[PDB]
Amino acid sequence: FLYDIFLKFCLKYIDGEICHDLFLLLGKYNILPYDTSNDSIYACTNIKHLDFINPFGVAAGFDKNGVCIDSILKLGFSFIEIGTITPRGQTGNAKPRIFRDVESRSIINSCGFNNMGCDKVTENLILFRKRQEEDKLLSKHIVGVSIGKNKDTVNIVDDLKYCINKIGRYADYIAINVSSPNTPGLRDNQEAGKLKNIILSVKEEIDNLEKNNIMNDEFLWFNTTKKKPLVFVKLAPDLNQEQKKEIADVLLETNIDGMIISNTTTQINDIKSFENKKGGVSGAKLKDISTKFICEMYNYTNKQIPIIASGGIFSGLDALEKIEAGASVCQLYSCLVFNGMKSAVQIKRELNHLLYQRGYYNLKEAIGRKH
Ligand SMILES: Cc1cc2nc3c(=O)[nH]c(=O)nc-3n(C[C@H](O)[C@H](O)[C@H](O)COP(=O)(O)O)c2cc1C
Ligand SMILES: Cn1nc2c(=O)n(C3CC3)nc(C3CC3)c2c1Cc1ccc(C(F)(F)F)c(F)c1
Ligand SMILES: O=c1cc(C(O)O)[nH]c(=O)[nH]1
């Protein structure tokens, strides 16, 4: 609650990244709040054998380097997507690179995959997994890893392969980021043919980790599921019916475990304070766009591919809209920026309360209910 006093200050006066680094730093030293209450079993959700204690996680780009996993999750989230990571560390584009307009509760960013690199982040998650093994409050929480290419890498597959070999065995799922606007030509790989080759290589590389073991599978996968990481793809709102039916076909043929919808958009033009700035736009103004993209991709894939919702989710209603559109689970980013800690507690009660008034035995009853 006290942090919500701090927030309205950090938003008025302080740069975003400085506020970001402070929040990560508070969590590094375990001085963030904890939600220790039972989540409604009536709101759990799943994607194949991934069982989510609740339908809300933290989107990629929040804990890029996995230095703050414990404390953020202990805040009341069921899972977190770290990354996007690249094989070697990158500083990203030139600072300043994140801007926020409170009036529209929106953000624009051109970070450019700044991270300390796979090797160092993997060591951070190894440490986390050892703490998770000992703490019940973290015992059922899922950690996925978002992976992308270095800015100057020519072949994306080569970057994706390296990450899997090094970190694949500690992740519960892998998110393929082909949708960042701030990496040049990165959304050209969303093309159907290259995407197929990428996908099938990701799934194949994961499959090879199993085969060359002398140990059991309990000991191979040092993660919550103690299982092979799933393979998800983060699609961009910057697609088109054609290219959305191109990709949908690839997804159907390659048996992708799920698709994350969506990344930021480069199509919001009515924000006065962000005019002439570069980067992708996040937040509420992306909500309706993202929801429409869920409907299309949920429809184009005949409901066979689970959808992970992302984009402008702030309230319980917003989440239910994503869920009723076809999403199984939701990810938050901007909501945490503008609402802070309460975000998880608040959105979970709103969703539970709304499920009660609108008549649902459980959450799965609501998935895709607009269709
Ligand atoms: C500052 C910032 C950094 C982000 N970094 C990443 C990233 O590294 N990898 C990724 O896949 N998505 C990244 N995203 C996209 C978000 O995860 C999410 O898809 C999008 O911002 C929608 O979130 P919203 O709920 O705030 O609207 C980033 C977004 C922002 C605002
Ligand atoms: C106000 N605020 N601005 C943010 C921002 O710009 N980003 C990035 C552009 C992506 N991320 C976050 C969130 C993870 C921090 C921002 C927050 C929440 C916030 C809460 C509390 C404090 C503290 F004072 F308790 F430490 C703080 F410093 C910041
Ligand atoms: O997927 C992504 C990545 C970035 C970034 O790291 O710059 N930014 C976004 O808006 N989306």
182 annotated as belonging to a binding site for a ligand = yes
Exposure letters 329-361 (e unless 16+ CB within 10 A, then b): bbbbbbbbbbbbbbbbebbbebbbebbeeeebe
Q: What is the dihedral of CA 63, 64, 65, 71, to 10 degrees?
A: 0
Which ranges in 74-191 belong to alpha helices (H)? 118-132, 156-167
56 neighbors 330 (Cβ within 8 angstroms):
yes
* Block residue for tokens 């959304």: 187
Q: How long is the chain?
A: 371
Cα 129 to chain centroid, rounded: 19
Rounded-to-integer distance, Cα 334 and Cα 106, Å: 7
Q: Is the dihedral of CA 292, 182, 56, 199 positive or negative?
A: positive
Q: Any idea of the CA torsion for 198, 201, 203, 205, to the nearest 10 degrees?
A: -140
180 is catalytic: yes
Q: How far is the CA of 98 from the centre of ligand 2 (A)?
A: 12
Residues with Cβ within 8 Å of residue 89, at least 6 apart in sequence: 115, 116, 117, 120
Contact between 155 and 137 under an 8 Å Cβ cutoff? The reply is: no
Atom of ligand 1 nearest to the CA of 263: 19
Domain spans, the chain? 1-371
Amino acid letter for position 333? Y
Report which ligand 3 atom has the smallest distance to the Cα of 177. Answer: 1
CA angle 334, 92, 184 (to 5 degrees): 90
Residue to substitute in 14, 65, 337, 339 for testing ligand 2 pocket (most ligand atoms within 8 angstroms of CB): 337
Residues 6+ apart with CB under 8 A from 285: 104, 106, 268, 271, 312
Ligand 1 geometric centre to CA of 283 (Å): 9
* Whole-number Å distance between alpha carbons of 99 and 363: 35
Close Cβ partners of 315 (under 8 Å, ≥ 6 residues apart): 347, 350
Bridge-based pairing of strands 258-261 and 50-52 is: unpaired
- CATH architecture type of domain 1-371: Alpha-Beta Barrel (3.20)
**Could you identify the atom of ligand 2 that is nearest to the CA of residue 15?**
6
Q: Which of 100, 183, 281 to mutate to test the pocket of ligand 3 (most atoms within 8 A of CB)?
A: 183
Catalytic residue among 179, 180, 262, 290: 180
Strands laid side by side in the 280-283 sheet: 98-101, 106-109, 280-283
The DSSP 8-state label assigned to residue 43 in this structure reads G
- Choose one of 85, 264, 281, 333 to mutate for the ligand 3 pocket test, by most ligand atoms within 8 angstroms of C-beta: 264
Helices 16-28 and 2-12 pack at an angle, to 10 degrees, of: 150
Where does the chain show beta strands of DSSP type E? Answer: 45-47, 50-52, 56-58, 79-85, 88-90, 98-101, 106-109, 115-117, 142-147, 173-177, 230-235, 258-261, 280-283, 307-310, 327-332
- CA 360 to chain CA centroid, Å, is 26
For 39, which DSSP code?
A: P
Question: Which letter, b or e, does each residue of 116-145 get, where b requires 16 or more Cβ atoms within 10 Å of its Cβ?
Answer: bbbeebbebbeebbeebeeeeebeebbbbb
Nearest-angstrom CA–CA distance, 73 and 26: 13
Q: Kindly state if the Cβ of 93 falls inside 6 Å of ligand 3.
A: no
Q: How far is the CA of 362 from the centre of ligand 3 (A)?
A: 34
Nearest CA, atom 18, ligand 1: 263
Rounded CA-CA distance 234/60 in Å is 10
